[PDB]
Amino acid sequence: MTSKMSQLERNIETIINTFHQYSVKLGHPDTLNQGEFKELVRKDLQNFLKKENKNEKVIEHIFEDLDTNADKQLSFEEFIMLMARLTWASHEKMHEGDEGPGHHHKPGLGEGTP
Amino acid sequence: MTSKMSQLERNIETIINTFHQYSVKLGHPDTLNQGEFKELVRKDLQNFLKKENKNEKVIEHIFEDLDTNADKQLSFEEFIMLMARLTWASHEKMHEGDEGPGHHHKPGLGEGTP
Numbered sequence: 228m229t230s231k232m233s234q235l236e237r238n239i240e241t242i243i244n245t246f247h248q249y250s251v252k253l254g255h256p257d258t259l260n261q262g263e264f265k266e267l268v269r270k271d272l273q274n275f276l277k278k279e280n281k282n283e284k285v286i287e288h289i290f291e292d293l294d295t296n297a298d299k300q301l302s303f304e305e306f307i308m309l310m311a312r313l314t315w316a317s318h319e320k321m322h323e324g325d326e327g328p329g330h331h332h333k334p335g336l337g338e339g340t341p
Numbered sequence: 342m343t344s345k346m347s348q349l350e351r352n353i354e355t356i357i358n359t360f361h362q363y364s365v366k367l368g369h370p371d372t373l374n375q376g377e378f379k380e381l382v383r384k385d386l387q388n389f390l391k392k393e394n395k396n397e398k399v400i401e402h403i404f405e406d407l408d409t410n411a412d413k414q415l416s417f418e419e420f421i422m423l424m425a426r427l428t429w430a431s432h433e434k435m436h437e438g439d440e441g442p443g444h445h446h447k448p449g450l451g452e453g454t455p
């Protein structure tokens with residue numbers, strides 16, 4: 228019974244609100260153009276994107292790549308994908324399957340009689 | 342100079358660190374099981390998931406659905422799209438009608454007359 232939300236909850240609202248403010252101003256609220264994408268990362272992550280700032284082409288490359296519709300805009304789902312892609316490419320991996328001892332098995336029933 | 346990083350930058354580290362701590366403890370660091378998924382949302386979003394807590398099955402349903410590999414775990418990319426799905430699933434709007442669940446069988450004398 229807690230009336231105070233965790234720090235994580237606050238962050239969720241902050242992320243949604245921040246994108247909404249920039250997005251609503253320009254283009255559809257649920258989509259981001261190249262200008263908004265660059266602006267959001269530059270102001271929020273100027274230190275992390277210092278190298279990105281030097282290469283303008285590098286920055287537009289990722290945005291366009293993430294846009295599957297080639298509509299020069301990214302969907303909400305597409306936007307979060309971009310962040311994940313930046314952190315790690317995540318190459319496709321395959322596994323044969325799951326296996327293990329299986330903890331043997333339960334005992335059978337004697338089914339004996341008096 | 343940049344001086345200090347914005348809240349958005351801090352939030353990014355917080356999200357990654359939080360998932361990492363729970364994930365590394367149980368299962369692979371880059372994957373989340375049902376227990377971690379439920380635990381992360383419950384502690385961070387106990388107020389938002391109050392209705393979710395009541396229905397345990399509803400909660401496991403979302404996790405399993407998001408898992409395309411049916412490997413009982415979600416990738417980093419899969420995890421972030423789960424949140425997006427929760428926010429908006431394009432659910433149909435509710436409307437008053439005589440529709441309802443079907444049960445038993447109709448009278449033999451009666452006919453479907455399609």
Ligand SMILES: [Ca+2]
Pocket residue numbers: 249250251252253254255256257258259260263
């Ligand atoms: Ca926009």
Ligand SMILES: [Ca+2]
Pocket residue numbers: 294295296297298299300301302305
């Ligand atoms: Ca698109």
Ligand SMILES: [Ca+2]
Pocket residue numbers: 363364365366367368369370371372373374377
């Ligand atoms: Ca894990």
Ligand SMILES: [Ca+2]
Pocket residue numbers: 408409410411412413414415416419
């Ligand atoms: Ca999976």
